[PDB]
Amino acid sequence: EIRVTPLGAGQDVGRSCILVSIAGKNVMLDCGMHMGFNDDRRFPDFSYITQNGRLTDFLDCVIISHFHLDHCGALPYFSEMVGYDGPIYMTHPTQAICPILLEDYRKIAVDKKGEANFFTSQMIKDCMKKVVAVHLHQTVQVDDELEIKAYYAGHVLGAAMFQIKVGSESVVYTGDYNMTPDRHLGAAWIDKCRPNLLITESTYATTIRDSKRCRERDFLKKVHETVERGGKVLIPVFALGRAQELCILLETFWERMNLKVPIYFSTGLTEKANHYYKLFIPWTNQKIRKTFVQRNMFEFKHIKAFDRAFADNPGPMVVFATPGMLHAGQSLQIFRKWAGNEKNMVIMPGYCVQGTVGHKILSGQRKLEVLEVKMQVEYMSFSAHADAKGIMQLVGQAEPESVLLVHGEAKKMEFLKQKIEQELRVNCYMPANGETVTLPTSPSIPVGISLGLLKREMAQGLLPEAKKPRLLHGTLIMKDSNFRLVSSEQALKELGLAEHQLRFTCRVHLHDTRKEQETALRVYSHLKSVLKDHCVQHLPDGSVTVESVLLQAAAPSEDPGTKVLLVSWTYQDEELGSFLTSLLKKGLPQ
Amino acid sequence: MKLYCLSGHPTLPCNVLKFKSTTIMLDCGLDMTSTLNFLPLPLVQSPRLSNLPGWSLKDGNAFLDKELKECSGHVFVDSVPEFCLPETELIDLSTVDVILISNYHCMMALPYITEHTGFTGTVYATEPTVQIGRLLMEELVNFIERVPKAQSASLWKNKDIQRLLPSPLKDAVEVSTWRRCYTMQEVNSALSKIQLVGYSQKIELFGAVQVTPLSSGYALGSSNWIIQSHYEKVSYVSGSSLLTTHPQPMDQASLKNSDVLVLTGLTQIPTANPDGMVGEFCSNLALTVRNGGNVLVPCYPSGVIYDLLECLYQYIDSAGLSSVPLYFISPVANSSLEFSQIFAEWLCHNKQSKVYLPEPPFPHAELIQTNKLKHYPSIHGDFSNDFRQPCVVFTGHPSLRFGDVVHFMELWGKSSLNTVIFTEPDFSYLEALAPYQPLAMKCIYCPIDTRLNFIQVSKLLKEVQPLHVVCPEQYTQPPPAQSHRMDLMIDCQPPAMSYRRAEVLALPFKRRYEKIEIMPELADSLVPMEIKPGISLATVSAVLHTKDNKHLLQPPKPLLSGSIPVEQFVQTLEKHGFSDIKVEDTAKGHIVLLQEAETLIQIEEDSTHIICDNDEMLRVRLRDLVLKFLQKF
Amino acid sequence: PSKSAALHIDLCKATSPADALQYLLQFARKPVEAESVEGVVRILLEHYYKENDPSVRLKIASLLGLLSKTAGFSPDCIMDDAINILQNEKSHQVLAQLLDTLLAIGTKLPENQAIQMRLVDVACKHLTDTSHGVRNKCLQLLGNLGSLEKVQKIIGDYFSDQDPRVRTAAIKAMLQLHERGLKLHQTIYNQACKLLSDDYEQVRSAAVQLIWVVSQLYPESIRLVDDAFGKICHMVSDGSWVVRVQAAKLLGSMEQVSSHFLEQTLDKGAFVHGLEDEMYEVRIAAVEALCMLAQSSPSFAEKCLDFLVDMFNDEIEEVRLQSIHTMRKISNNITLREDQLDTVLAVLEDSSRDIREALHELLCCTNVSTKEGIHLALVELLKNLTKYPTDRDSIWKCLKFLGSRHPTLVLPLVPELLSTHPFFDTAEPDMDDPAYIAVLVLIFNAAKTCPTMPALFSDHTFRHYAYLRDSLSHLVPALRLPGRK
Ligand SMILES: [Zn+2]
Ligand SMILES: [Zn+2]
């Protein structure tokens, strides 16, 4: 029995929280922030599981997919006042990059609201102390049966899907994987391991993405046209994210074309990227594990530094500022400063979350508080999430017994289900916000076995007598520390009740005028003729051997019209002896 | 369960293990001590090496004047240095299935076995091990390549010549199996069949077995392996440093609950003191640069030199000797320092907490923003117009037979003003100076070893005690140098085992208890039939689905035990309807007669014997009656 | 003599793990016998055959197989090995020794009939072990011993056995059967198409080869090669990279396919994912595949054209070199409308000597249908000349072949490329400047066919033609100018 409950990201993006229970183990899959409205409902309702009490006794381990604000978002609230002294299992690069990123979001929050209720720095460092770093393809035992297992995905730096094994039951949480390879990131790879449930992201499922070169040739020609009109290419994109891929892309274009434009880079996390990608190449793509000895591809000889006083410059100006959803304020300072202009250009990086300016401009309206739309937009989609082909690839390569679709929206939810039931014939389900999806999993019991039993089993099996029931045997013993299956004679000698050799004998009383030697010959002929594929032989002393059954012509009885035939057999051929007695009751031919 | 031993050198091992059906060949070390028997390879010819007297046997029959040449009472064979490979002919190595690699020091023999045998299997290693192994392979093939030498020497391998050769040339094992160096194509192909494993990755092989690494701490990327089923576990430790070092610390948890703890890869010299020994390094290096003159350090491109650089950097801030420069000359130098910089999560836990902060883990970066460490690919270029006397120079291969180390071992080896600082074990100190004597170059044997010595070997063995111990005789027998003392040995009290080069050993534990899995319908169709307290019993009957070496059980004879009481038998016969049943007694049994169905039954100790007439329903009734008064097994 | 002495020494010493292993190792490592007496030494090998410690027996029979590899013996060793297999069948080590000896004897020299490849194969097939003892290696025994040009059923029912290793060896036996001909059947296609999802590595990398071979046997299933090629394209998307290499290469062994499904590979998806995943192995295999299937298909070639121009920034010199090759092979009736800018700025590199000469080989065999493309190609190659005064001969060859390939496109360039001011006198350019020579050799190689070009020169240009014809006769061709008749 496995239960799963989405405390967010079911039919939603942001506040991605999943609680899974496997055989009495409660595991927290992912926790982020809603990336949206300013009320109390951007942080998940912790009272759904505990209300007024402790969370340590219920929840065992905490798993973080990557460092997105919808996936590394609400970490201080688990650690400090809602409280969790237990382990926070998450990868090395994500542990390197979440603290400064949530510090940046703290700066945004205190600049927005001026609120001391968001969190402080001493407490986020306290959250960062009790975090256990997890490597690449790697097992970690949590207490004594709960295995956690991290696999390379490729969504951002240090982006991994996770796998949880309790006994023999496995659940796979896949955060924001991309089967399509990136430029400094690779692809996703999970070994097919008969997974019970696959928690899969389905952000992009209505559309099939083309080749990558379509994406950058479209984006680059539109950028080229914008700078040809003198427009200033302002990309509302967030931190590390798709930021450095668009950086290296623009750097390649501006260095192969040799056109002059004073591009800059956002404040705060500015050189943090430079030292953070130069210490985590083994998590990156295999192009730059081999091509890094020449120079620093991650150090840019064309980018420069932005500050608050350069926003009024005319001429060409291709700078990007955080975030990607246009909700922080400094990008909103740029956007509100640049609202009444037709010559410039803003853009959107990827998907958008409800309630933000990004979704508000994705709908296609004008007023924003009102800021009428004079800019131009184009749905460029470098945001590294797998398309429906990626869904096909990961699901068909993992081949799970059940799936669960999160981190998306309803139309592609129904589309992607109906596709998954029509082709791979697996129990695809709808999760929503709050309900408990239950899968009754098949239990597994491992027992032991003796070497001799499998030795004679393979010796009999590889002989050409297959495809029919061979009916193996043995007996099973309870010690409540191990459950043991042992062969029969070894069980006789270990329990010590001795080999009980059995002699079942019976007198076949035949009423006919034939002689007793002729009667024994008739019995031998009848048993040879009726029993096909049976070792029926006649002994030289008038006896008949049928496997382990002995038939002897006994002494004549006191009745002249009655003849006595002794039939003896053991319990190993008890059914054969019963059939022989039935046939001899049916009568010899006469 | 057979261990085939193919390498005789204690810390460059090769061990095939036939387990269930696997043929796991642990480690491929290439014995380079054979290369000490040759003349060096200078990139430019010296008048000294060219003009040496050729040794002649007293018989004079053989043409060995041009074969081997003598120098200062020590003779060496003049050709390309040969390499001491393991036996590729003891067992058919195409039947080797998976090769496991512990560290980069035991990977140098991989191209020979992987492209000259027929080995179609896979090799597994951690990615730091494969990266530094690739760089060391390129190092070796480049230094052996640069100036070609043809193997024109062949007659010294025959039996009577080699026993008529003098020492140390008598001390050579299987010179006929020695083979020249390897080329580009099998460098590229040997690093294609390799796969990338993580530190304690639970990785299965062929559906049969499980292999997994552990942290070792001997070097950056070193691994100690475990081959196990669910009911047995043979572990292979090769190189560990529980002394305070840079990589991830040793794991003591997956070593216990094991039966074999093969002690490959211990220290070269037990009598050492590494902290004081690198103190001695700093001492004589400081003395030589204080007198004014360079120091020469033979070194691998990776490994302990990294540690050396750290303390040496620190010692500059204690010595006021920032004037003397640091040079690293190697064809893989920039890539070596790069891979030192980047492979950082595999370091210590507090070194991981240093990676928490945006700072470089290895402090040679701080040596290069201070313009202290200068790395060059070769002398052929930027080193010519930047060289500064006096200096500290780190050179090529420490065997002192090929690289740039031969050039600086010449030229500067003329005055007592300078010194050379040997720092790396598993190469003999006096044997390295043997082609270079007579010589005025100052020499200090200052070897830095990080491998655990016999005291912590004893601590390890009393910590995670196995059922069996496998090690070479160099660990059992007292060492040839300090043979007078018993103390620094293996100290265990099971009977330890000893393997020589190319030996077969049967591991004395037999597989007897293997593993089976059951689908739940059968599990619910079983009943417990508890008969003797604490000990339950159940009848099991199924079919066994065979697939991928993990056997299952699917739905498609139990016997009798327990003597039957005759009195209860006749009582239940009388109460079931049967009548007029008469019982008589014998010496040890009872004869009971039923006049219906003409039945006579005799009962004795552990014996029953029914005899009936031609009946079916009464026969099967008696069957179910007598089988329900006992216990089924 | 020496063999008898070694046998006597081994019998006299008679140590179990000490004398036998060391003596056998010394006998193997020292020298080969290279005589018929080694067969007599095989009788000595029969002398130590009846002994315990089966590792020594395995080593001895391995030495026997090594002696059989020297072709010293013939049928007597085969009979002795058959007797040893039928008598000394004791566990996996002796089974390995006997089957290795049988494999060596079968391919030693004769490889013929009359109990040389049939009786041994029958003995191998009749001695299948119960668990891995001979199974994979007796399958390769029955592989290399072809019975007659008619026995595939025993391999056929062994596609679904236990061990994946035995599956791989059954596959390799099926390979070696196909390499001898033997007229393979049709049910192998069914057993192979059910063999893709074996859920484990090292079988799919050869299952794709089995799909290829039974597909190019004959294309008659319902259409056969389209479904097989679609399965191969599905195997291109596998996570493992060795199977991707094998899938791309073994589809690169194909030569026939339906056209429409071949354009289906790129839209609605194999080559759209078959390139940008791994190191040079997958990429070079896929682009050799597009080489052959652009050579076989006269159509489609604009699609492989613009799927090669994207992959210029792969940061591998081998990928660049073999990419220049993979589009120089397919440069037939193919023009470059917009994708010529990247292929001419790709020359911009520090040394790239092999890459540069490959690029000059590409530029002299390409076809183009525009004028501004000629202008940009010429100005970029002159910039290459002014940055590297090293390869003037190579650029003279490629400009000669560029002029010879298409003369028409450069007719409007001559009023623009050189100083031909209408009323000002054109000064005589520097003759020894080895950059004006390149544009002259273009001009006069393009002036061989078009008649409207002698009227467009000047007097100094005819005297330059005179000196270029008399000096570099292998660069400029002979023209019908009145100055040089
Ligand atoms: Zn994400
Ligand atoms: Zn996300």
Axis-axis angle for helices C372-387, C353-363 (nearest 10)? 150
What would the DSSP string read from start to end of C91-128? HHHHHHHHHHHHHHHHTSS---SSSSSSHHHHHHHTT-
Closest by Cα among C120, C73, C122 to C98: C120
- Indicate the DSSP class of residue A8: S
E strands, B137-288, are: 194-197, 203-205, 209-212, 225-228, 233-238, 260-264
Tokens matching residue C459: 């007097």
Sign of CA dihedral B154, B156, B159, B161: positive
Q: Does C333 reach chain A within 8 Å, measured CB to CB?
A: no
> What's the start-to-end Cα distance of chain B, in Å?
33
| Cβ within 8 Å of residue A63, ≥6 positions away | A27, A28, A29, A30, A89, A90, A148, A162, A164, A173
- Per the CB < 8 Å rule, is B548 touching C96? no
Which SS3 state, helix, strand or coil, does residue C282 take?
Answer: helix
List residues, by chain if needed, whose CB lies under 5 Å from ion ligand 2.
Answer: A 68, 70, 176
Ligand 2 centroid to residue A14 C-alpha, Å: 7
Nearest by CB to residue C132, choosing from B21, B91, B177, is B21
Q: B369 to each of B191, B204, B244, how far by Cα in Å?
A: 34, 46, 27
Size of interface A-B (CB pairs under 8 A): 187
With CA atoms as reference, the chain A residue closest to C306 would be A213
> What's the start-to-end Cα distance of chain A, in Å?
65
Q: For the range A304-312, what are the long-range contacts, defined as Cβ-Cβ under 8 Å and sequence gap of 24 or more? A: A304/A262, A304/A263, A304/A264, A304/A265, A305/A264, A305/A265, A305/A267, A305/A270, A306/A264, A306/A265, A306/A266, A306/A267, A307/A267, A310/A264, A311/A337
Axis-axis angle for helices C204-217, C225-236 (nearest 10)? 160
- Indicate the DSSP class of residue B601: E
Q: How far is CA A567 from the centre of its chain?
A: 63
Which SS3 state, helix, strand or coil, does residue A222 take?
Answer: helix
Ligand 1 centroid to residue B453 C-alpha, Å: 50
Tokens matching residue A495: 């329990």
Q: Report strand pairing: B98-100 vs B23-26.
A: parallel
Instruction: Report how far residue A301's alpha carbon sits from residue A323's, in angstroms, rounded to the nearest whole number.
Output: 24
Q: Does C184 reach chain B within 8 Å, measured CB to CB?
A: no
Which SS3 state, helix, strand or coil, does residue C349 take?
Answer: coil
Chain breaks in chain C (C to N over 2.5 A) after: 150, 222, 268
Instruction: Report how far residue B528's alpha carbon sits from residue A511's, in angstroms, rounded to the nearest whole number.
Output: 47
Residue A465 known to be catalytic: no
With CA atoms as reference, the chain A residue closest to C276 would be A181
E strands, B344-415, are: 373-376, 392-395
Tokens matching residue A461: 């099996």
Tokens matching residue A346: 């803003």
Instruction: Report how far residue C445's alpha carbon sits from residue C404's, in angstroms, rounded to the nearest whole number.
Output: 6
Instruction: Report how far residue B504's alpha carbon sits from residue B15's, in angstroms, rounded to the nearest whole number.
Output: 10
With CA atoms as reference, the chain B residue closest to C96 would be B92
Instruction: Report how far residue B342's alpha carbon sits from residue B360's, in angstroms, rounded to the nearest whole number.
Output: 9
Instruction: Report how far residue C122's alpha carbon sits from residue A237's, in angstroms, rounded to the nearest whole number.
Output: 72
Q: Which residues of C touch A252 (CB under 8 A)?
A: 313
Closest by Cα among A318, A154, A307 to A247: A318
CB atoms within 10 A of CB A321: 23
Main-chain dihedrals φ then ψ at residue A219, nearest 5 degrees: -65, -40
Which listed ligand is nearest to A13 at the C-alpha?
Answer: 2
Tokens matching residue B126: 């951690």
- Per the CB < 8 Å rule, is A256 touching C276? no
Q: A338 to each of A305, A317, A344, A374, A375, how far by Cα in Å?
A: 20, 13, 8, 9, 9
With CA atoms as reference, the chain B residue closest to C162 would be B547
Quote the minimal CA–CA distance from C327 to chain A in Å.
19
Instruction: Report how far residue A148's alpha carbon sits from residue B150's, in angstroms, rounded to the nearest whole number.
Output: 56
Instruction: Report how far residue A504's alpha carbon sits from residue A509's, in angstroms, rounded to the nearest whole number.
Output: 16
Structure-determination technique: cryo-EM
Q: Does A196 reach chain C within 8 Å, measured CB to CB?
A: no
A496 phi-psi bin (left φ>0, alpha ψ -120 to 50, beta other): left
Residues in chain B: 633
Are B559 and A571 a contacting pair, CB within 8 Å? yes
Tokens matching residue B40: 């060096």
Mutate which of B1, B4, B90 to test chain C, going by most C C-beta atoms within 10 A?
B90
Axis-axis angle for helices C459-471, C436-446 (nearest 10)? 90
Closest by Cα among C57, C25, C63 to C41: C63
Closest by Cα among A110, A131, A139, A157 to A61: A131
On the question of a cis peptide bond just before residue A323, with omega within 30 degrees of 0, the verdict is: yes
E strands, B241-353, are: 260-264, 295-298, 326-329
Query: Can you name the residues that pair with A5 across neighbouring β-strands?
Result: A19
Q: Which residues of A touch C310 (CB under 8 A)?
A: 211, 213
Tokens matching residue C297: 């298909």
Ligand 2 centroid to residue A322 C-alpha, Å: 16
> What's the start-to-end Cα distance of chain C, in Å?
88
Quote the minimal CA–CA distance from C258 to chain B in Å.
35
- Indicate the DSSP class of residue A12: S
Q: Which residues of C105-141 are buried (b: 16+ CB within 10 A; e: fewer)?
A: bbebeeeeeeebbeebbebbbebbbbbbbbbbbbbbb
- Indicate the DSSP class of residue A26: E
**Range 508-527 of A in CB contact (< 8 A) with B:** 508-510
Are B633 and A495 a contacting pair, CB within 8 Å? yes
| Cβ within 8 Å of residue B67, ≥6 positions away | B77, B78, B153, B155, B156
Tokens matching residue A557: 């009885």
Residue with tokens 């390409």, as numbered in its chain: C366
Instruction: Report how far residue B212's alpha carbon sits from residue A137's, in angstroms, rounded to the nearest whole number.
Output: 12
CB atoms within 10 A of CB B151: 12
CB atoms within 10 A of CB C395: 25
Q: Does B389 reach chain C within 8 Å, measured CB to CB?
A: no
Ligand 1 centroid to residue B552 C-alpha, Å: 40
Instruction: Report how far residue C98's alpha carbon sits from residue C88's, in angstroms, rounded to the nearest whole number.
Output: 9
Quote the minimal CA–CA distance from A192 to chain C in Å.
7
Q: Which chains touch B (3 or more CB pairs under 8 A)?
A: A, C
| Cβ within 8 Å of residue C255, ≥6 positions away | C216, C292, C296
Ligand 1 centroid to residue A174 C-alpha, Å: 10
Are B235 and B468 a contacting pair, CB within 8 Å? no
| Cβ within 8 Å of residue C379, ≥6 positions away | none
Query: Can you name the residues that pair with B561 across neighbouring β-strands?
Result: B631
- From A169, A201, A216, A245, the catalytic residue: A201
B582 phi-psi bin (left φ>0, alpha ψ -120 to 50, beta other): beta
Instruction: Report how far residue C276's alpha carbon sits from residue C298's, in angstroms, rounded to the nearest whole number.
Output: 26
Quote the minimal CA–CA distance from C247 to chain A in Å.
17
